Amino acid sequence: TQGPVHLNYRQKGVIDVFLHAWKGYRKFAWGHDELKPVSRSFSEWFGLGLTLIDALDTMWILGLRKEFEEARKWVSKKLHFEKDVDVNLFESTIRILGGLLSAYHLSGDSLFLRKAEDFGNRLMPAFRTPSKIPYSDVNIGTGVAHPPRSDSTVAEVTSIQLEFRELSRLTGDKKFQEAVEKVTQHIHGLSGKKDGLVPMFINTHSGLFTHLGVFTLGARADSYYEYLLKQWIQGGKQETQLLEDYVEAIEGVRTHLLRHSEPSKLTFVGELAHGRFSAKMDHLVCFLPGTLALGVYHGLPASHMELAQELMETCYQMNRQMETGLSPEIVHFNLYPQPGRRDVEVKPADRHNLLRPETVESLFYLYRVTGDRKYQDWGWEILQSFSRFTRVPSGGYSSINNVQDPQKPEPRDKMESFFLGETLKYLFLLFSDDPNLLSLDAYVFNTEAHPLPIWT
């Protein structure tokens, strides 16, 4: 129960929260996908030690080597992909493949690469479709892929590129990169976009966008825009088509989904359905200011910076207007002049908070790019809310049902893997005053906070 002396107090705090969280996992869900902190149990989604894998690079970065070594032992002896189980190509890629690739790079342990290549190969069946656009699911054990319980979601097939490309680079096996790039290239020419904005679904057989006319930057589309830029940065900034699509998409966001609340004029991104704008914004969308700032660092328009700063402020407010200080799953904004009206509105069904990272993720980028200490302060405040309302005494942290009630937040008895894989990682990195720690010049984070090296 002692941490390194060099660490500033905020990073130590993050480490203290991690240990408490890791504690519950070690005692009640060791080797299992997700922890059930409240009931001191666990749940299985893939049965591949999701949380352990998703937290490998986080432990390494926080200097929790003893913990890392123990988790490394489990991967070495308990992780088996020879299982008859269906997995989502996207969720598997960003957490498992990305998680292993990061672990391999930070630790240098070839074990993680071996597992990654193994897993990468078991995921390939998913691309066996008429259009080459991948099926949503794939049984890693039997080798057969298939659509969900129809179509595939656009974000899902366009948010697996960084991982597959890197695996090809490290293994020399080009099939991973090729499959994944074919998808990106096909999406590039595909019509049905509204000034860069892509629809939520795409048919694996016809390879065409479906559910036309409905656009959103939240679930089902979000990371698509994120990976346009990140792939660009990953490839040494030479794949200009990615860049072009990205800047077009941003302008498209400005022109069709960007609005301002009343009476405070909070900048926010809403959803568009067949011409009808909806002042609705998923917390998921809070990744945008982060990606926006990232691009600015890499030479994108200064107008992108203002947008980033504005949206960072809004996402911050999305958390702070809540009684617990934690943002709800979805936030509606008031759009028309009404005196005593609040800017932020939240429907009862959306008052949940699953310890998502999007806000702290973007604060990290905003600070790295602006150097403005207030973003660190904001992150510190959010960590406090997590500690005060989501902490489980016996160990771990839990998602909650009521983000608006500090006396009865209502734990849902579940700790998402992205909490240790992302939320605490970004917070640790946010509180760092060393620009050389996973520099924006050398590394690029996949959509699950797993850092991958920028190529030369």
Ligand X SMILES: OC[C@H]1NC[C@@H](O)[C@@H](O)[C@@H]1O
Instruction: Indicate which residues carry an active-site annotation.
Output: 91, 222, 329, 358
Contact status: 447 vs Ca ion (CB under 5 A): yes
Backbone phi, then psi, for 155, in 5-degree steps?
-60, -45
Residue 267 forms beta bridges with which residues?
A: 260
Range list of H helices, 173-239: 175-189, 222-234
Stretch that binds Ca ion, among 20-28, 406-414, 433-441, 446-454 (CB under 5 A): 446-454
Inter-axis angle of helices 240-256 and 175-189, nearest 10: 40
Give the separation between CA 79 and CA 370, rounded to whole angstroms: 41
Give the separation between CA 65 and CA 59, rounded to whole angstroms: 7
DSSP 303-335: HHHHHHHHHHHHHHHHHHTSTTS---SEEEE--
Is 314 within any annotated ligand binding site? no
Which listed option, Ca ion, ligand X, none, makes contact with residue 152 (CB within 5 to 8 Å by class)? Answer: none
Residue whose CB is nearest to ligand X in the complex, by number: 356
Residue whose CB is nearest to Ca ion in the complex, by number: 447
C-beta neighbour count of 355 within 10 angstroms:
21
Place of tokens 């949380």: 51
Report 403-432 residues binding ligand X (CB under 6 A). 418, 422
Contact status: 309 vs ligand X (CB under 6 A): no
Of the pair 90, 378, the CB lying nearest ligand X is at 90
Shortest Å distance, C-beta 219 to ligand X: 8
Shortest Å distance, C-beta 329 to Ca ion: 15
Of the pair 283, 332, the CB lying nearest ligand X is at 283
Which listed option, Ca ion, ligand X, none, makes contact with residue 356 (CB within 5 to 8 Å by class)? Answer: ligand X
- The reply to whether omega before 453 is within 30° of 0 (cis) is no
Extract the tokens encoding 123.
Answer: 């995921």
Report 221-260 residues binding ligand X (CB under 6 A). 223
Binding mask 90-119 for ligand X (x = CB under 6 A): ----x-------------------------
Query: How many residues does the structure list for the chain?
Result: 456
Contact status: 447 vs ligand X (CB under 6 A): yes
Extract the tokens encoding 28.
Answer: 């009640």
End-to-end Cα, the chain, rounded Å: 41
Stretch that binds ligand X, among 125-133, 264-272, 298-306, 353-361 (CB under 6 A): 353-361
Contact status: 417 vs Ca ion (CB under 5 A): no
Q: Which residues are documented as binding site for Ca(2+)?
A: 447
Where on the chain is the footprint of ligand X (CB under 6 A)? 94, 223, 356-358, 418, 422, 447-448
